[PDB]
Symmetry: D2
Subunit: 301 residues, 4 copies
């Protein structure tokens, strides 16, 4: 035919998060063609140069730098960004989707911009798209930060820690302690459990503390953001803690929010209802409610 390309990824916003994500992909042999778009076209040119000179050294991807690329483009990751935030980004966002949509996009969205659950909701309303194809970054990094600290604690690997952070990827989020294991051993390894509400405070004050000695978080997210990518593209059917549309599940009804979902090559398969505890349902409820608010408050632009 021509020169094909069955695994394409467009990043809108080639800033710290966008670029480090890209370098993630590439260094990891994940996508096939990677387009890169930025209002700051000159920054895209530079990034894309840079990426193309190291290429040879990695294992084989393509890197290009409008939206006309989003049309047989398997997925679009929006890394672009500014309640006078929620209104700024909604604003920003309102042109991004439209623009990509207006190219006859048929794929998936990966939103990672703050405030994610919200910008994720907005991306859907603006997309038209079914809510199984519009994915938030959500509490993914949170769960990693958590899994890390714990694993760190216990001396095993974060990879044997099984604990989720659910709720608003922000202040309102909560650790599901009731269901948190190391392999199959509950945290019955310590009692009070359900030193550790310590672990979770760091897990939660992490952004602030990283920003404060370095100006920003960007490596972390991209790792997380490259995981979902991997899940989507490879039909993994994996259970990542994303930013999913609540169905009526957890008994919430028109909020996007940080939840275990099953990812694979067609968006989300299904949300999971971990059997949340007493105080969790209340935490979750509060959290979902903090969002469902900003949702009706804001919007407009």
């Amino acid at each position: 035919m021509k020169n094909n390309g069955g695994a394409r990824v467009v990043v809108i916003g080639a800033g710290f998060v966008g670029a480090s994500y890209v370098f993630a992909l590439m260094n990891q042999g994940i996508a096939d063609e990677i387009v890169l778009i930025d209002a700051n076209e000159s920054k895209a040119i530079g990034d894309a140069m840079d990426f193309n000179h190291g290429k040879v050294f990695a294992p084989k991807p393509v890197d290009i730098w409008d939206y006309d690329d989003c049309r047989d483009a398997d997925l679009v990751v929006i890394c672009a960004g500014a309640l006078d935030l929620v209104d700024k980004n909604i604003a920003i966002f309102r042109s991004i989707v439209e623009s990509v949509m207006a190219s006859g996009f048929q794929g998936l969205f990966l939103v990672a911009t703050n405030p994610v659950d919200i910008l994720t909701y907005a991306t859907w309303k603006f997309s038209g798209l079914p809510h199984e194809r519009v994915i938030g970054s959500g509490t993914i990094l949170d769960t990693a930060r958590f899994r890390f600290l714990l694993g760190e604690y216990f001396s095993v690997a974060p990879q044997n820690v099984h604990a989720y952070i659910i709720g608003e990827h922000g202040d309102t989020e909560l650790p599901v302690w009731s269901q948190a294991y190391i392999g199959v051993m509950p945290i019955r390894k310590l009692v009070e459990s359900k030193d550790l509400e310590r672990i979770f405070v760091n897990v939660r004050d992490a952004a602030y503390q990283i920003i404060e000695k370095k100006g920003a978080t960007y490596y972390g997210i991209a790792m997380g953001l490259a995981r979902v990518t991997r899940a989507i593209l490879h039909n993994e059917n994996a259970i990542l803690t994303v930013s999913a549309y609540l169905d009526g599940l957890y008994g919430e009804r028109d909020v996007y929010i940080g939840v275990p979902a099953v990812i694979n090559r067609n968006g989300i398969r299904e949300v999971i209802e971990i059997e949340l505890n007493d105080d969790e349902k209340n935490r979750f409820h509060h959290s979902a409610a903090t969002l469902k608010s900003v949702l009706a408050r804001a919007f407009t632009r």
Copy 2:
């Protein structure tokens, strides 16, 4: 025993080049333990946090943030940096080596700081170390940029292009056209050869052009810098175009300079003398001479 670690890497300088290198390693499953040092300790703390939260998502490395780490530390990559440059960095450098040396280091150095061939020479004089264990970054990125453009041209993969950039990683460097193939087909695919002195001008004005729309090159080098790393650590016995000490080979005698060398787990094995052409010997000679100059000019501090 304790908790071991047979593959350690210390980066002095956790700036753009340092950090992107690190993220390179990690995303690529290359070292085992990665220490990170920076005069700006706060930037190291932040980077190291950031790296540690995404970890779980990659395949298994350790990340820590003095020099006391350089003592069973397999290799030290100096990413730190400012003729009132050559004197600044020599200056900077003069404390780095000493400091790491004073820890009872026994390993290899990877210099990537400009002006590399020079800072590479200086690192040796300051190291004490045999010149087979002090490696410059040298014309590695150049050769990649070259291999890329060509491969790009010919429509094959940079990975089938065989062409070297030798000489000063800078202005004075030269493309070895006389010996430049695509697989085994010389560039006898086009004539004039030994559109293409075009390819090489871009290869050579690349830094300027990338810096100018983005402020700096950092992804490229790290790819290159992660290749050598791979070579060293894995005993590859590979022929990379490094920043090697000229022996009397190419008939030059006390200059570090961009040359094909054979890398593997013990430093450099041996330099290669590609059979350079007439005009090349003259280019090479000029180039080596531009350095051997700055070498006796500068120094002091």
Copy 3:
């Protein structure tokens, strides 16, 4: 120095299991140097040829084909093999260890030969070695077969299934249902639980059924056998269900047996006592007792 090699692996027995293991390693970029030994030296020559011609295509290992290789050899995997079995192999085995031991080995053993828990015990008695450095293959494949069927069932990935098979890697083994999750959701997704005692019967009759249409299992084990390898060599601190020496834990006292252990670059770190249920303690007890028997029964040779 010479030409080093910090990651070496000797396989005694280059049969189906040995060779497929090797091809596993290599295709997976895991060890650095791989020696291969077999009473049938001619089969080693052939395998090692074969492996060396494809090499170039994989990412960089070395393959050689006595025991004098076991002396700075990081680990030795015994893939060699024939109660007139237990006496045959003990017999076989009794020369293997001795021979490798007599080379001044200082490393770890990976036994995968049936009957593993037993040949694993024997390898220890014969090694001299601390029981944290003599590792059985144990119920690793079992747990995989299990994780697979379940994951298969539930439609997620085996990688989100958390369920262990503990006890004798054989007839007497038991599934720890009481502690078996999908992420963090117990199997409270179905009731009777603690269609599924179906899943576990296949998990347990798998060898017989694979052997019967193909003569043998060899891919499976090597995957499993390459996982532990990965764990050992990379200091993973991972929780694999190995063939560990019971301490007095599970309240058993001089039996090697299939248990969660924490693996990393120095043997086993520590065994875990999952909080086994009523009927499990009884199953476990019976199982451990089936072994502790064959142990005093057999031996001699």
Copy 4:
């Protein structure tokens, strides 16, 4: 939609070569879905079991075990096999293609069965398919065996050796010495060149010698066979020495034969005419002629 799968591979013949190829893929994270077909359905069941139990340990592929799978099946690798050979396999083959063709296949063929150039020609005649979509295994392993021995010799890595074996993957093949480098240094490192006609005799008597201490070659080919796979599926635009249809190039006209071709996601891009030497054109000519013979001799069935 359903559960997709954009990277599928059907192997007809799940023998030594077929299975080791599969294990290659899987252990290497290359295809996405891998179907496996064999006249000996019971051997497919067993292999596919075996593969599925280790899965979890590798990074994510699917394995299933008629031809109805070849219909959105990206590629079909024929590993199946018996002049009363050429007539047996042609015979065998004549049903394979037909059968897969009769499923509405639209993809590529990878023939690896001996006598390959011939069975590759036959697969085309029987396919209907354009000759850019019917690929022979050809002199790939030969070139590897060659690259290996040399690299072995010179002490560098086979990966820096650039030398091709062209012609019949068999007796009649020839080493293109005239164009054979190490990086960019011709073999002007030794003279007589165009100890070494030694290297090439081993390169050529390798099968016989491996078969004779082990019954067969199967790891080697699968490495090679997994390289092309990688090339096809990832649009590499790489220059592998395949089994291509000669155009009139090398001035030959209706023979499939071992040649440098450029591989990528749509079959072959283009054949290359290395500038073959005097004695080579004569060797090549003889070789091509040995085939063009068996071609008109045989056929029928």
